[PDB]
Design a protein around this nucleic acid. Sequence first.
RNA 1: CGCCUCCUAAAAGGUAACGGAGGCGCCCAAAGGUCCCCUCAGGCGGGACGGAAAUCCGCCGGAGAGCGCAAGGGUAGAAGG
RNA 2: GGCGACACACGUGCUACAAUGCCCACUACAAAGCGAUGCCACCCGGCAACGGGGAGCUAAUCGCAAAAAGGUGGGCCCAGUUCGGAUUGGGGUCUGCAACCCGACCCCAUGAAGCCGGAAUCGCUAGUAAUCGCGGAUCAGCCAUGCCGCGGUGAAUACG
Lengths: 23, 69, 181, 83, 118
Amino acid sequence: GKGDRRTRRGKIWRGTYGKYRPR
Amino acid sequence: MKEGIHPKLVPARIICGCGNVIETYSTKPEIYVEVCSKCHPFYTGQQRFVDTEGRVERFQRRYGDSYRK
Amino acid sequence: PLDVALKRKYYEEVRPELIRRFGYQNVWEVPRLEKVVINQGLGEAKEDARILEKAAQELALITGQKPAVTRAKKSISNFKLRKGMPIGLRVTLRRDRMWIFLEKLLNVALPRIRDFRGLNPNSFDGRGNYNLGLREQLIFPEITYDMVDALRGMDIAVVTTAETDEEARALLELLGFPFRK
Amino acid sequence: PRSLKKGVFVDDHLLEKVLELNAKGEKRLIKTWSRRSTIVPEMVGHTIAVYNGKQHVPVYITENMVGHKLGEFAPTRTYRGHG
Amino acid sequence: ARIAGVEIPRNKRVDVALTYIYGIGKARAKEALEKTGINPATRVKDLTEAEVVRLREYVENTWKLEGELRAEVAANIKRLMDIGCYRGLRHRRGLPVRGQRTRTNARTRKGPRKTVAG
RNA sequence: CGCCUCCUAAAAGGUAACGGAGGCGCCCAAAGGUCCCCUCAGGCGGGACGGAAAUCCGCCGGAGAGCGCAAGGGUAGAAGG
RNA sequence: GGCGACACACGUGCUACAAUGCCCACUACAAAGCGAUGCCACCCGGCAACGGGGAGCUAAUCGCAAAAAGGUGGGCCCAGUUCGGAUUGGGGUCUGCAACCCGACCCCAUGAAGCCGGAAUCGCUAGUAAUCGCGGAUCAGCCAUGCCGCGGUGAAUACG
Ligand SMILES: [Mg+2]
Ligand SMILES: [Mg+2]
Ligand SMILES: [Mg+2]
Ligand SMILES: [Mg+2]
Ligand SMILES: [Mg+2]
Ligand SMILES: [Mg+2]
Ligand SMILES: [Mg+2]
Ligand SMILES: [Mg+2]
Ligand SMILES: [Mg+2]
Ligand SMILES: [Mg+2]
Ligand SMILES: [Mg+2]
Ligand SMILES: [Mg+2]
Ligand SMILES: [Mg+2]
Ligand SMILES: [Mg+2]
Ligand SMILES: [Mg+2]
Ligand SMILES: [Mg+2]
Ligand SMILES: [Mg+2]
Ligand SMILES: [Mg+2]
Ligand SMILES: [Mg+2]
Ligand SMILES: [Mg+2]
Ligand SMILES: [Mg+2]
Ligand SMILES: [Mg+2]
Ligand SMILES: [Mg+2]
Ligand SMILES: [Mg+2]
Ligand SMILES: [Mg+2]
Ligand SMILES: [Mg+2]
Ligand SMILES: [Mg+2]
Ligand SMILES: [Mg+2]
Ligand SMILES: [Mg+2]
Ligand SMILES: [Mg+2]
Ligand SMILES: [Mg+2]
Ligand SMILES: [Mg+2]
Ligand SMILES: [Mg+2]
Ligand SMILES: [Mg+2]
Ligand SMILES: [Mg+2]
Ligand SMILES: [Zn+2]
């Protein structure tokens, strides 16, 4: 869900980028 | 040796993942294993596994030293 | 008698080295191997289950010998056990079957133990005997994951003709028992 | 933590103390407030009195406590328990 | 004992089954499949013995796993507890180590509630 | 208030008191007959779960165990398993 | 140094307990705002946070900026699970003189409770509820799941 930093949804919720939510 | 109550033993082979073939007598004439005595790390001297750096927990990094001495 | 490699190795490489190290003047002074006794203290089959049959079948496959039932010698409330009820199994291995079982143990059973770092060097009886304890039964080659229903351990008694620990220790390391430092 | 492109931080007022000790009779009892200062391997062997906000706690440094900070070895709150 | 002394479940894909090993996650369960030439889409029950032995060898050679990893973690926690570190002190009492609040919450560490008389 | 065991009871037997202590009014279809085999309690050391104490191994241990139920006598060269 | 304590008790919230779902890839569609010790295009290096070059924009011109739910295709097949993401170990980035007490973020490993919640109790009558994302003030950085705003999709029911 939104509480997991290792997913697209979780990175979107935290407003950050990384391997799972690239820019 | 009583009769009718003991599983009869037959000649058998045990094959390991490392290709080792051990010859013995067993109740099953063909056995396959994943580790034997000739490839287990504790038997082949040390066979250092994924951990081999002695934990390097002392001051054995020297952590730079580019700062003033 | 079946030509077991472990018995062959004892008479070829171990006996001549033992007399070299300890200087026995008699060929019957050098330590021999007497018997192996495997005990399974189930304790869960007192009255809640007749699951002794499942363990008897598994033990017979590992050693080739049908084990015998051991009964309680008295009643104890704290264990909720009555006198005369079956609470264990035991099998005695001698001669060829003794040699065959130890060869499998040293070669295909002990290497399969989780986080094996060697055997206890302080488990020697003090008069020339050794005892080790196992927690798992699926490490033996004849046991597969399919027919395993419950986890069970055992105690293995190794009895030698050696009089002292130091002479019994020498026989076991040469035979192939790996010990911790 | 601190970035490795930067060096490990020492306040340079306690570093001068241990350095001056190392060549002038290298064992005494130093009192410091720099809880943020990182322990250095040179600091091993010294007994440093670190402020907890109320008192100086003596800390004897060893090898396995080199990368930490001094403040982690002077607890600041006294709890015991409830009751 | 199939891989690293553990039995990865059948009827599941190899990448999903690998994560059942202590020390192996989804990222490593993809790395161990992109370095042994094995399709992640296949089930564990359908694998050639060469694939199984190569995967086992590569996994047990690459990463510290299972009991060895547990020993490393426990040794690190013991090191923190012995030297009198603040994290060591909070490991002694079973309290949060990463600076969380303890007036409320902190139930994963402290366990069940222990209501008293107010 | 009948019966059994010990003491009092004075080294044969017997011996009183509202003298000193305890039990019985059953039980077992094997806990009976015979043949064959076996030998304890305890202590020390070793052994997965498993401990003061389960089951297993080694050593010492002559009867301190056991013998359905009180006590006494008897008893492993068995009356015990 | 403390306001960050911690046998406990309460209020307001956030995330869930799954298939009208979760994950992955591609592909659409807003509004209102902010930006000169600033916003940062694009290119290069690292899985990444980010770092090194370096345009344009004192901004209906350049940037933040990717909207997300959606649409298409594939994977998972009823499990404490490819549900859930707490706790902890390790390796790092950045801000700051300085992240131990006491910051945020990235990566690896760990993968807790939780199977829809007792007595009880709250909001809401239409572009409302529900659900999805976006901006701003404070501000070096941020413990914002708060607050003030903005738009997307869009119900049920009112007998009395
Ligand atoms: Mg002996
Ligand atoms: Mg795993
Ligand atoms: Mg009368
Ligand atoms: Mg009568
Ligand atoms: Mg007389
Ligand atoms: Mg007489
Ligand atoms: Mg007389
Ligand atoms: Mg008279
Ligand atoms: Mg008279
Ligand atoms: Mg009377
Ligand atoms: Mg009388
Ligand atoms: Mg009596
Ligand atoms: Mg009576
Ligand atoms: Mg009577
Ligand atoms: Mg009868
Ligand atoms: Mg009788
Ligand atoms: Mg009789
Ligand atoms: Mg007696
Ligand atoms: Mg009685
Ligand atoms: Mg008698
Ligand atoms: Mg007797
Ligand atoms: Mg006798
Ligand atoms: Mg406050
Ligand atoms: Mg706190
Ligand atoms: Mg309130
Ligand atoms: Mg609440
Ligand atoms: Mg939340
Ligand atoms: Mg899961
Ligand atoms: Mg998940
Ligand atoms: Mg801080
Ligand atoms: Mg649970
Ligand atoms: Mg469920
Ligand atoms: Mg209420
Ligand atoms: Mg109204
Ligand atoms: Mg909140
Ligand atoms: Zn092998």
